[PDB]
Design an enzyme around this catalytic site. Structure first.
Site, PDB file in Angstrom:
ATOM      1  N   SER B  39      85.986  81.279  27.933  1.00  0.00           N
ATOM      2  CA  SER B  39      86.313  79.896  28.245  1.00  0.00           C
ATOM      3  C   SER B  39      84.995  79.113  28.270  1.00  0.00           C
ATOM      4  CB  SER B  39      87.045  79.803  29.585  1.00  0.00           C
ATOM      5  OG  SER B  39      86.366  80.517  30.589  1.00  0.00           O
ATOM      6  N   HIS B 157      91.145  85.150  30.380  1.00  0.00           N
ATOM      7  CA  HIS B 157      90.539  86.479  30.556  1.00  0.00           C
ATOM      8  C   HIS B 157      91.563  87.621  30.673  1.00  0.00           C
ATOM      9  CE1 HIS B 157      86.626  84.666  32.502  1.00  0.00           C
ATOM     10  NE2 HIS B 157      86.865  84.212  31.282  1.00  0.00           N
ATOM     11  N   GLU B 166      90.003  82.997  37.768  1.00  0.00           N
ATOM     12  CA  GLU B 166      89.423  83.994  38.671  1.00  0.00           C
ATOM     13  C   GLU B 166      89.745  83.848  40.161  1.00  0.00           C
ATOM     14  OE1 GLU B 166      85.145  83.805  37.844  1.00  0.00           O
ATOM     15  OE2 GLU B 166      85.460  83.619  35.687  1.00  0.00           O
ATOM     16  N   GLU B 209      87.281  90.801  33.061  1.00  0.00           N
ATOM     17  CA  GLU B 209      86.248  90.978  34.062  1.00  0.00           C
ATOM     18  C   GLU B 209      86.516  92.056  35.088  1.00  0.00           C
ATOM     19  OE1 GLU B 209      84.995  87.218  35.619  1.00  0.00           O
ATOM     20  OE2 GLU B 209      84.064  86.604  33.721  1.00  0.00           O
ATOM     21  N   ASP B 244      87.863  80.332  40.413  1.00  0.00           N
ATOM     22  CA  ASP B 244      87.377  79.662  39.221  1.00  0.00           C
ATOM     23  C   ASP B 244      88.668  79.303  38.489  1.00  0.00           C
ATOM     24  OD1 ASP B 244      86.478  78.634  36.867  1.00  0.00           O
ATOM     25  OD2 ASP B 244      85.267  80.365  36.281  1.00  0.00           O
ATOM     26  N   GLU B 292      85.702  76.538  41.590  1.00  0.00           N
ATOM     27  CA  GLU B 292      84.929  76.216  40.392  1.00  0.00           C
ATOM     28  C   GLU B 292      85.823  75.559  39.339  1.00  0.00           C
ATOM     29  OE1 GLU B 292      82.938  79.666  38.656  1.00  0.00           O
ATOM     30  OE2 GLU B 292      83.234  78.822  36.648  1.00  0.00           O
ATOM     31  N   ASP B 317      80.865  74.190  36.328  1.00  0.00           N
ATOM     32  CA  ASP B 317      80.537  75.230  35.355  1.00  0.00           C
ATOM     33  C   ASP B 317      80.600  74.557  33.982  1.00  0.00           C
ATOM     34  OD1 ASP B 317      80.258  77.487  33.686  1.00  0.00           O
ATOM     35  OD2 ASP B 317      82.306  78.147  34.017  1.00  0.00           O
ATOM     36  N   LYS B 342      74.535  79.795  34.222  1.00  0.00           N
ATOM     37  CA  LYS B 342      74.756  80.721  33.121  1.00  0.00           C
ATOM     38  C   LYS B 342      73.638  80.466  32.106  1.00  0.00           C
ATOM     39  CE  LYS B 342      79.856  81.178  33.318  1.00  0.00           C
ATOM     40  NZ  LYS B 342      81.137  80.534  32.878  1.00  0.00           N
ATOM     41  N   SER B 369      75.687  83.479  37.492  1.00  0.00           N
ATOM     42  CA  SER B 369      76.866  84.066  36.889  1.00  0.00           C
ATOM     43  C   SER B 369      76.654  84.795  35.565  1.00  0.00           C
ATOM     44  CB  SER B 369      77.900  82.949  36.696  1.00  0.00           C
ATOM     45  OG  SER B 369      78.968  83.339  35.861  1.00  0.00           O
ATOM     46  N   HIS B 370      77.577  85.716  35.289  1.00  0.00           N
ATOM     47  CA  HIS B 370      77.648  86.502  34.052  1.00  0.00           C
ATOM     48  C   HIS B 370      78.567  85.684  33.131  1.00  0.00           C
ATOM     49  CE1 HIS B 370      81.759  88.170  35.639  1.00  0.00           C
ATOM     50  NE2 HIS B 370      81.578  86.885  35.898  1.00  0.00           N
ATOM     51  N   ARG B 371      78.933  86.237  31.971  1.00  0.00           N
ATOM     52  CA  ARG B 371      79.920  85.602  31.096  1.00  0.00           C
ATOM     53  C   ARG B 371      81.044  86.650  31.049  1.00  0.00           C
ATOM     54  NH1 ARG B 371      78.717  80.769  28.634  1.00  0.00           N
ATOM     55  NH2 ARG B 371      80.978  80.542  29.072  1.00  0.00           N
ATOM     56  N   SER B 372      82.250  86.246  30.656  1.00  0.00           N
ATOM     57  CA  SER B 372      83.368  87.187  30.583  1.00  0.00           C
ATOM     58  C   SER B 372      83.067  88.255  29.533  1.00  0.00           C
ATOM     59  CB  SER B 372      84.658  86.453  30.231  1.00  0.00           C
ATOM     60  OG  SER B 372      84.456  85.620  29.100  1.00  0.00           O
ATOM     61  N   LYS B 393      78.248  85.761  40.933  1.00  0.00           N
ATOM     62  CA  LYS B 393      79.541  86.288  40.534  1.00  0.00           C
ATOM     63  C   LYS B 393      79.246  87.077  39.254  1.00  0.00           C
ATOM     64  CE  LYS B 393      81.717  82.774  37.450  1.00  0.00           C
ATOM     65  NZ  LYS B 393      82.951  81.927  37.255  1.00  0.00           N
TER      66      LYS B 393
HETATM   67 MG   LIG Z   1      84.446  79.549  31.563  1.00  0.00          MG
HETATM   68 MG   LIG Z   2      83.989  79.498  34.592  1.00  0.00          MG
END
Ligand SMILES: [Mg+2]
Ligand SMILES: [Mg+2]
Ligand SMILES: [Mg+2]
Ligand SMILES: [Mg+2]
Lengths: 432, 432
Positions: B39, B157, B166, B209, B244, B292, B317, B342, B369-372, B393
């Site tokens: 996303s 996701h 999330e 995730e 999120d 988020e 985000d 990110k 944060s990480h990415r999916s 996260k």
């Molecule tokens: Mg996203």
């Molecule tokens: Mg996000």
């Protein structure tokens, strides 16, 4: 040359604790972690858990970590052993434990150190890890294996009725390892669409090994979906199918339950002959060239009979548990013709190489394997290359505890360069 | 001090190609990989894909890898720039690309090199990576963050009906990071039972995730499931909830579709006021302290209005895309009060640090944060510690592309020893 060893508890891919070991030499820090299976055969060396139900549901490994920190580490540091002496070090640990199944320290404690020692040994020699393993195994040549991607998950690795554990695709027809990865990924992505179109998005979430977990019961349907995805991806000429039944998981007092995840009912159980014939129909209707654990771990009669009449590679996993003693019996009775190599089923790098060599010396294939519970460790990538087995299953191309290994294999192929070899269609016996 | 740079194509946690970079200095080899979102906001820096429909369905990154191998590397090696000069190196690459959104080389190309350079710099300075990041950010102190575990996955996701992306649990009441991990893991395993008992096994598979993917449509039920699992694990007094929504994903020309994964039907779209009313009820009934992307990346009016009356943390985000210019507009409009950081949304280590300091100087919280779509890379673990944001996260405690980060944070805490500080209840701003 071992200066310090320090272990800690970390988390595996299912979020369960596992052992990690840091080992120091003058060359630096070497780190390794231990995998953990879900469908673990009763003959596997002991994976030691704390069993404190208030902590991690009883799955902590602080006792194993303590065995390393308070016992193994000081013993090894005192002996001043050279990290390249894998066999002496592993044997010392086996002797210190003194039990048949490493239940004093736990196979997870011993393996953690064993692996870290091996990684330190390679750097000690200034040679790549797969080369050091090759040396320890007595191999001069090294080769990239064909990867077997478990793209549809069932049994104890997924939330569905599907009784059989793994449905794998093997790109034996690839030009090299990188193309094998590309083919694996493309078929995997095509499969997500095939499943989505037929069963909806809710059938495209994944099980423990990154394979899709569709809500189906029929194992034939699993095979049918793979075949459709392969054709749709345009690789019918380069991909064959492999399976891991993990029959020991649904063995019921002599018979087998292909719906063991639904409320029990003996009336649905089938006999080993019925199961054997089912596999034969699968072998007849689909490009299935390999089947792992088609029967219970001690249903020796069925194994011998099936291996003698199936005409394909039959992999022993829970039957052999990477144990030379069990392997010896299997070779004598011709119970199977391939060994699934899981370092944590026996507990040390040395016994793992012994198990591999025993199998190879008897004309058996050998497929190196991860556990359903993995970590970011990539040891088995170098291991399969150094052991020249020609075949490895380390997951679907999804979830990094799987791709970490595949990516490492890509780095090894790259490092080997123009002289790189790939087993391809000769995966069962890469060095003719 | 950069002797050589080589980039290659590897696989991310979803089985898609991404960039990996090897950088060499006299101190050795330094490797880093690049994450990829699902996303992704329209304002994110360009993730350059090959778009060759025959290869990986157009997702190859051979072009980005080539920009590095054929252009960025030779240039950086020629300039003989020192790896500890992050800003100069990043600016040089930014100047070479010459575009606002890094559309010539691709943000994925520049970030891969930017990350490898940062790791090399830390070793060159003979200090841990988080300490190096701290020096680059001008922070004297360093602290462990409260982890935000995404235990139920929805939106883009997972294959369920669940629209919101999330559902996270934050162990703000834990005494230290290791207990935070224990709480996270135990709540996750209890949640698996809660979901299994109520929805069956098919509801226990996981999303991108690592969070469970029950096929529920009600976002509120997701929150109720978390509440139940937290209670069952016995940590009701130590855990709060974060979400999120990823509202840009279901934004429908002004309205919002909370059932966007079902065949389109405008009759069910709701207004941003109705969507806000839903958040207000969540905040009333559950310990939700952070939300988020509650609205679309450019629905600026709804953001301002909600944040002004909320009382909790509101995270930008897709609104801010780790971009100083978007952040500045958000600070002036009081659109939100927390930045999701990110690194691949802007493309460089230097810009990411500038985005973080900008947010902090304005009193905003920052959640790394990480990415999916992740890899085995663990850079963000050191990043959040060195930036002292107090919150990160990086997944459910499932799938190693997530655990590799949590495991690294456990290692950082251990290395920090007795003096290790943990954000805990001061996670919104561990400074003050
Ligand atoms: Mg996203
Ligand atoms: Mg996000
Ligand atoms: Mg098994
Ligand atoms: Mg098995």
């Amino acid at each position: 040359s071992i200066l310090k060893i320090h272990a800690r508890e970390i988390f595996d891919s299912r979020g369960n604790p596992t052992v990690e070991v840091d080992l120091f030499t003058s060359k630096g820090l070497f780190r390794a972690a231990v995998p953990s299976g879900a469908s673990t055969g009763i003959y596997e060396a002991l994976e030691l858990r704390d069993n404190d139900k208030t902590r991690y549901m009883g799955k902590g490994v602080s006792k194993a970590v303590e065995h390393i920190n308070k016992t193994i580490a000081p013993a090894l540091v005192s002996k001043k052993l050279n990290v390249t002496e894998q066999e002496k070090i592993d044997k010392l640990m086996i002797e210190m434990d003194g039990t048949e199944n490493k239940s004093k320290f736990g196979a997870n404690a011993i393996l953690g150190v064993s692996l870290a020692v091996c990684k330190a040994g390679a750097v000690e020699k200034g040679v790549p890890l797969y080369r050091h393993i090759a040396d320890l195994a007595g191999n001069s040549e090294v080769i990239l294996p064909v990867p077997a991607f478990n793209v549809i998950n069932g049994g104890s690795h997924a939330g569905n009725k599907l009784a059989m554990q793994e449905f794998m695709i093997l790109p034996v027809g690839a030009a090299n390892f990188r193309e094998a990865m590309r083919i694996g990924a493309e078929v995997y992505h095509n499969l997500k669409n095939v499943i989505k179109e037929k069963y909806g998005k809710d059938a495209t979430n994944v099980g423990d090994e990154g394979g899709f977990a569709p809500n189906i019961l029929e194992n034939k349907e699993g095979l049918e979906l793979l075949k459709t995805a392969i054709g749709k991806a345009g690789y019918t000429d380069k991909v064959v199918i492999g399976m891991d039944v993990a029959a020991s998981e649904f063995f019921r007092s002599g018979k087998y339950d292909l719906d063991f995840k639904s409320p029990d009912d003996p009336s649905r159980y089938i006999s080993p002959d019925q199961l054997a014939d089912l596999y034969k129909s699968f072998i007849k209707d689909y490009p299935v060239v390999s089947i792992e654990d088609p029967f219970d771990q001690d249903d020796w009669g069925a194994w011998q009979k099936f291996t003698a009449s199936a005409g394909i590679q039959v992999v022993g996993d829970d039957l052999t548990v990477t144990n030379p003693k069990r392997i010896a019996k299997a070779v004598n009775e011709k119970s199977c013709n391939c060994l699934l190599l899981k370092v944590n089923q026996i507990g040390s790098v040395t016994e793992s190489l012994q198990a591999c060599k025993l199998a190879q010396a008897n004309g058996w294939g050998v497929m190196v394997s991860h556990r359903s519970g993995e970590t970011e460790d990539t040891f088995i990538a170098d291991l399969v290359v150094g052991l020249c087995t020609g075949q490895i299953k380390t997951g679907a191309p999804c979830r990094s505890e799987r791709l970490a290994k595949y990516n490492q294999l890509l780095r090894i192929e790259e490092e080997l360069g123009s002289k790189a070899k790939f087993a391809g269609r000769n995966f069962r016996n890469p060095l003719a």
